[PDB]
């Protein structure tokens, strides 16, 4: 039904279709790597492939899974869903840009450097699921996700 619904997605959540396509691409890429890494180990990974693996782990652990018996995630409106996906895919894009701009330099950014520098931002991306749709209003949750986006857009600038 995905092709039937885009007529409605593009006029209620205009960003959601590209976000969804990128999320699926990311999970497919991590699936493709998984067979290689299992047999070979992470030493062979490219620096963009490390970002793919780590963003996929972020999405699986902290966007896909949803403890259905908790006041924060028994229900998850679509504003919250698309917000979480937008932040995670924006993180992915910024990290891949940071890697592809400094792979040719002496200022080489790596997943380890990003991890160390943004241990906080990654934990926020991990704890986005705990925002409560009713205990915290839609406006509050969207504002907090926008603020996390700002925090990330500042962290990456300060990293580079």
């Amino acid at each position: 039904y995905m092709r039937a619904l885009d007529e409605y997605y593009d006029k209620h959540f205009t960003e959601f279709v590209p976000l969804r396509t990128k999320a699926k691409e990311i999970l497919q890429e991590e699936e493709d790597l998984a067979e290689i890494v299992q047999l070979v180990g992470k030493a062979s990974l490219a620096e963009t492939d490390k970002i793919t693996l780590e963003v996929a782990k972020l999405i699986k652990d902290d966007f896909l899974q949803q403890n259905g018996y908790t006041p924060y995630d028994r229900f998850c409106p679509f504003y919250k869903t698309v917000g979480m996906l937008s932040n995670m895919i924006s993180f992915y894009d910024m990290a891949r840009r940071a890697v592809e701009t400094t792979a040719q330099s002496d200022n080489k950014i790596t997943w380890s450097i990003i991890r160390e520098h943004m241990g906080e931002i990654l934990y926020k991306l991990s704890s986005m699921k705990f925002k409560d749709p009713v205990k915290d209003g839609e406006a509050k949750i969207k504002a907090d996700y926008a603020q996390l986006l700002e925090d990330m857009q500042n962290a990456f600038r300060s990293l580079e």
Binding site: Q38, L39, V40, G41
Partner: protein
């Protein structure tokens, strides 16, 4: 020359042990599990065929009783 050979052999040994462990801990067990599953499912096909043939035989016997 000795040291260079030593280092390169260290790398080669690490890689080959990783390959051997990969095979004998992932690839071979995967194939063994698939083989067990294949044998079980072929037993299932055979059992279903046996049941169908048994049913046909019973129906032929009942036909004999219906005709005689």
């Amino acid at each position: 020359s000795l040291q260079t050979s030593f280092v390169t052999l260290d790398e080669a040994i690490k890689i080959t042990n990783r390959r051997v462990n990969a095979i004998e801990h992932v690839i071979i067990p995967r194939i063994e599990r698939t083989l067990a599953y294949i044998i079980t499912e072929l037993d299932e096909r055979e059992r279903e065929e046996f049941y169908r043939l048994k049913k046909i035989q019973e129906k032929k016997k009942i036909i004999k009783e219906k005709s005689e």
